Structures are given as C-alpha cells and as structure tokens.
Amino acid sequence: GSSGSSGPEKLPYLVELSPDGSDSRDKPKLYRLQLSVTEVGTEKFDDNSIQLFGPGIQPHHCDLTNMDGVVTVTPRSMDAETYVDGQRISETTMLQSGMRLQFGTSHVFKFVDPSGPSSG
C-alpha cells in the first residue's frame, strides 16, 4: 500500500570497483546512499553527497534517490556518461545489488543493497 521503509542500518552503498570492474586487493571506498536524493559528481550539493574526482567527470553527474528500499540512477547531465553494468542510461534506471556503475569510464562502483532482495 503506502507506508514506507525504515532501515538506516541496511542502506544501499556504492563500493568503488577497479577500472575493469574487479575487486582490488585493497579496501575500496564506500558510500552509503542514505535516505533522500544523493547528488553525485565533483560538486557539493548536499552535506552527505557523493564527491567524485576524475578526468571527464561533471558536477551534477547523477542523483541517487532511495525510494522504498529502491534506488534509481538519475543522470542530471547527458554528458555525464553513466553506465549501469556497462550499460548506459537515458533516464531513471533502477539499481540492483551487484550492478556496476561506470562514471566517466574511470570511476566504477558496485551498488549493493544490505536491506535484502525482498525478504531473505
């Protein structure tokens, strides 16, 4: 119906992955996509926003909005190349745990949902 979700201890995060989409031998950065829209890029929109720095990155790349344990990548700029698992998007594209996110063909990240794939 219409109630909402409550689980700050199980929010979706983006674990930066290698430039090939592999798990390095070190600890990659993590960005817990907390409730509310999360603007990405090099610009600082929100206090707890995603600040990525790379050659070919923009200020307003995309905004991660968690709506009911659901997150969808929203490219604010067309120039900002956003590929979800090696697949470019052209609008709000639902994100799933495991799916990769290539930002400017350099900053690759892996989105994971600690909430759970609908029960489990």
Swiss-Prot record:
Residues 38-104 form the FHA domain. Isoform 1 is expressed only in a restricted set of epithelial structures during early embryogenesis. Disulfide bonds: none annotated. It is found in: Cell junction, Adherens junction. It comes from the Eukaryota. Homodimer. Interacts with F-actin, nectin and NECTIN3. Essential for the association of nectin and E-cadherin. Isoform 2/s-afadin does not interact with F-actin. Interacts with ZO-1 and occludin, but probably in an indirect manner. Interacts with RIT1, RIT2, NRXN1 and BCR. Interacts with ADAM10; the interaction locks ADAM10 at adherens junctions following ADAM10 recruitment to adherens junctions by TSPAN33. Belongs to an adhesion system, probably together with the E-cadherin-catenin system, which plays a role in the organization of homotypic, interneuronal and heterotypic cell-cell adherens junctions (AJs). Nectin- and actin-filament-binding protein that connects nectin to the actin cytoskeleton. May play a key role in the organization of epithelial structures of the embryonic ectoderm. Essential for the organization of adherens junctions. This is Afadin. It comes from Mus musculus (Mouse). The gene is Afdn. The chain holds residues 381 to 502 of 1820 of the full protein.
